[PDB]
Design a protein around this ligand. Structure first.
Ligand SMILES: Nc1ncnc2c1ncn2[C@@H]1O[C@H](COP(=O)(O)O)[C@@H](O)[C@H]1O
Length: 838
């Protein structure tokens, strides 16, 4: 656990170390033949004196750096002889390119050799070489050894690198540099500053240069098909791969435009092709994927922008970045974060200057091979391998049909597709298919009839007492026409009679409609008329009048005494006639602006939601739950019926009690509350409230409704180290909650996942065309399974738009709910909430 200054200074110190080796040009060469250590010195010294760059040093001389060219050129070759094989070669080769040079005075190109089988290692500094110059140096060394092996004084160089540098000084000052600057500032203006590729970990504040790589090859079949495809469109094999990778990245990142950089040799004139020195320049290629282009159309755009880029390749890329004046970040590279390098007809790269670096070359077999180098801090290895699979899949689709929309080509492999759709939705759990919500309570009454069921301000009802009260009212409801799918509105503040009413409606075979008296009269009257209930159960004191032939029964007070004359025996299953597919409640949701919609929720889904909750958290009969949520919110559904189904007691909070910080803590302590709910905003008030640390008896805090910030979860641990924090997600249209995540990791992330689907529930992250997206890609959350509600009461058109057929359940008639929520799968099979679709 380092401090902030130490962690910063560590990343600052280790950034320089890994980047210190990134300014070298290594190269290996195995020498087979006769042991000819005599014919090697003249071939190495002649090549040194041939290129005045290799024997050039640099000094300070009053304000600016200057070049100090020397006369004689001697080669600094260290000699050894190793016993161990693989482990020894990798160690000597690593420190060969890792041991720094002396740019001040001394050599800048080293060498090591050891043994009729030798190994000539060569390493140059980037200020006097590059990738092209390394192969030219080995090209020259092979000829000079051959001329020695047959024959002294071994074609002369046509131009000096200082002549190139002197020409560049005038060109940078000329008006051709100003035109090339004007084009690049035009081409890259307003381009996206940072690619939003899905990362397995959040981006570090300081760019971590730790890298790794994977190997990828295109077989001869795909390689030939890409050659033929590119021939049809007048593009090179590089333009085709560039077009594919950009389309893939734009699709994965959810961005319309993608900027990909490419190292260019920058030896335009045929005069500098044999020269050694720093010549590479970088070009930033802005590829647009908007408008759903076709494979042919995208290839035409890339072909034009690559040709336009290669015409303006003299301008140094540093002057492009300086002109664009971007918000330079310490966390990512400027202008682009992805590089594609292409070699034509080395050690494993562990340094990552960019997020992804795709290196590809054309092999001898006609196949295309290379590597994909990734930043270890951002991506796991399996993510990068899936990324490489997408590219190969996208390339194959471009060959199979170059007229289709490029952004709709299938890229998912069958393994990942089956994992997303099936494996991560393996939630089937057998439950009694004929049990209704109230029957869960009735089964518990028989097990513990004298146990405490309800507590409200010094009043108590046992399980038997509560069941008999509900039976009496349920028989009165039956006498007023309450039955399957019929609604019973309930208007009351919290009290014992609130739970009597809810249980009585379910026992009578109907569905309850909660009417919170705190809402405006106009709102209550709309819901009362929209639901068209048979009966209105009303607390004494409430003045809500339905008219319209609706029967009004008093819920408490002297006016409720008549239905106490009803027998307290239970109604038979044939008397109420209710079944799990019948409605249990209609709870109105606002959604946005306009009239609220009544969500019709059936018994079977509620039973499944309650049975899962007990399996996951194991509420015991001696525990207490706090009823603090307004009963017009469906979170109250499990507050009511979870403890009553398992034997625990439900403590009804004082009306508007959760808004008093003193009352909440005092009630938690005074009543031994073990489980309660918070929306994240009110959990913040709880952890900031006086005396929250007194609540060490709390067992479970369930959080839902809003995004749960990781900092709040971590803050709750410091205040109540014993409490289990659980993040639950779900809309009303899918029965309260459909995913859950326990916040029990030793280190909690800033984005707390919403978790994994609950029992008999499926989750899908789909694109605009209803197709599953790769792991980590954002898409719209769709919910399947038994908890999907029946629909919106009296809104068949809206029901049809949001409750769509389920093509993935493998059973006819199944339906999905389109949530309007954005989410993504994490690589560990957990879901992450990202926001609203609009
Ligand atoms: N754990 C959660 N994290 C983020 N948003 C949530 C969570 N739970 C619920 N929501 C949001 O609340 C909506 C449902 O609210 P409601 O239907 O009023 O219960 C969801 O569609 C989400 O937008």
């Amino acid at each position: 656990p380092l401090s902030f200054a130490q962690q910063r200074l560590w990343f600052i110190a280790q950034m320089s170390r890994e980047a210190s080796g990134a300014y070298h040009v290594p190269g290996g060469l195995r020498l087979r033949g006769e042991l000819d250590e005599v014919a090697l010195r003249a071939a190495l010294d002649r090549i040194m004196a041939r290129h005045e760059v290799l024997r050039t040093r640099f000094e300070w001389h009053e304000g600016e750096p200057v070049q100090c060219i020397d006369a004689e050129a001697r080669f600094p070759l260290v000699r050894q002889e190793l016993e161990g094989e693989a482990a020894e070669l990798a160690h000597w080769q690593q420190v060969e390119a890792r041991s720094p040079f002396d740019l001040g005075t001394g050599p800048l190109i080293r060498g090591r050799l050891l043994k009729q089988e030798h190994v000539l290692l060569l390493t140059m500094h980037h200020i006097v070489s590059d990738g092209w110059s390394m192969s030219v140096l080995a090209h020259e060394l092979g000829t000079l050894y051959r001329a020695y092996a047959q024959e002294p004084e071994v074609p002369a160089l046509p131009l000096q690198y200082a002549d190139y540098a002197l020409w560049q000084r005038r060109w940078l000052d000329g008006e051709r540099q100003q035109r090339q600057l004007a084009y690049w500032q035009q081409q890259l203006a307003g381009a996206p500053a940072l690619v939003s590729l899905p990362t397995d970990r959040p981006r570090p504040a300081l760019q971590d240069y730790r890298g790794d790589s994977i190997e990828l090859t295109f077989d001869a079949g795909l390689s030939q098909g890409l050659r033929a495809l590119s021939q049809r469109h007048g593009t090179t094999l590089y333009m085709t791969v560039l077009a594919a990778w950009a389309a893939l990245v734009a699709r994965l990142a959810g961005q319309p435009e993608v900027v990909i950089g490419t190292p260019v040799a920058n030896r335009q004139r045929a005069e500098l092709e044999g020269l050694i020195g720093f010549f590479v320049n970088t070009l930033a290629l802005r590829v647009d994927l908007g408008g759903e282009p076709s494979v042919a159309g995208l290839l035409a755009q890339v072909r034009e922008r690559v040709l336009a880029a290669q015409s303006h390749q003299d301008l140094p890329f540093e002057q492009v970045v300086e002109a664009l004046k971007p918000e330079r970040s310490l966390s990512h590279s400027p202008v682009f974060q992805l590089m594609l390098s292409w070699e034509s007809s080395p050690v494993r790269e562990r340094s990552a200057q960019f997020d992804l670096s795709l290196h590809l070359h054309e092999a001898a077999d006609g196949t295309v091979a290379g590597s994909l180098t990734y930043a270890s801090a951002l991506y796991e290895r399996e993510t990068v391998q899936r990324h490489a699979g997408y590219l190969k899949a996208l390339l194959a689709g471009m060959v199979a049909d170059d007229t289709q929309p490029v952004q709709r080509i299938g890229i998912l492999g069958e393994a990942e597709r089956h994992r997303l759709l099936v494996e991560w939705n393996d939630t089937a759990r057998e439950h009694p298919r004929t049990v209704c919500v109230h029957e869960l309570f009735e089964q518990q009454v028989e097990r513990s009839p004298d146990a405490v069921a309800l507590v409200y301000e010094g009043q108590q009802l046992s399980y038997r007492e509560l069941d008999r009260q509900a039976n009496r009212l349920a028989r009165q409801l039956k006498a007023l026409g309450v039955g399957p799918d019929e609604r019973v509105a309930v208007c009351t503040e919290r009290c014992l009679e609130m739970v009597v009413a809810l249980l009585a409606v379910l026992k009578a075979g109907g569905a309850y409609v909660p009417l919170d008296p705190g809402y405006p009269a106009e709102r209550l009257e709309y819901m009362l008329a929209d639901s068209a209930p048979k009966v209105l159960l009303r607390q004494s004191g409430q003045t809500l009048e339905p008219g319209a032939g609706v029967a009004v029964l008093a819920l408490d007070g002297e006016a409720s005494q008549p239905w106490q004359a009803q027998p307290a025996q239970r109604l038979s299953r044939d008397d109420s006639g209710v079944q799990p597919h019948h409605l249990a409640y209609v709870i109105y949701t606002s959604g946005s602006t306009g009239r609220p919609k009544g969500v019709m929720v059936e018994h079977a889904g509620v039973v499944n939601r309650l049975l899962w909750m007990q399996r996951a958290y194991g509420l015991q009969p001696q525990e207490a739950v706090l009823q603090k949520t307004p009963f017009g919110f469906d979170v109250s559904v499990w507050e009511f019926f979870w403890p009553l189904a398992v034997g625990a007691r439900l403590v009804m909070a004082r009306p508007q009690g959760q808004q008093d910080p003193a009352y909440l803590v005092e009630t938690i302590v005074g009543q031994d509350i073990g489980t309660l709910h918070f929306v994240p905003s009110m959990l913040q008030a709880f952890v900031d409230s006086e005396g929250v640390q007194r609540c060490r008896g709390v067992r479970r805090i369930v959080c839902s409704g809003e995004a749960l910030p990781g900092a709040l979860a971590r803050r709750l641990r410091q205040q109540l180290p014993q409490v289990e924090l659980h993040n639950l997600y779900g809309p009303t249209e899918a029965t309260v909650d459909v995913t859950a995540w326990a916040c029990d990791a030793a280190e909690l992330p800033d984005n707390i996942p919403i978790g994994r689907p609950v029992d008999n529930t499926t989750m899908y992250v789909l694109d605009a065309h209803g197709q599953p997206v790769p792991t980590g890609v954002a898409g719209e959350i769709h919910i399947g399974g038994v908890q999907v509600a029946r629909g919106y009461l009296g809104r068949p058109e809206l029901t049809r738009e949001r409750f769509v057929p389920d093509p993935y359940a493998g059973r006819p008639g199944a339906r999905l709910y389109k949530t309007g929520d954005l989410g993504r799968w994490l690589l560990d099979g957990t879901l992450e909430y990202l926001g609203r679709n609009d």
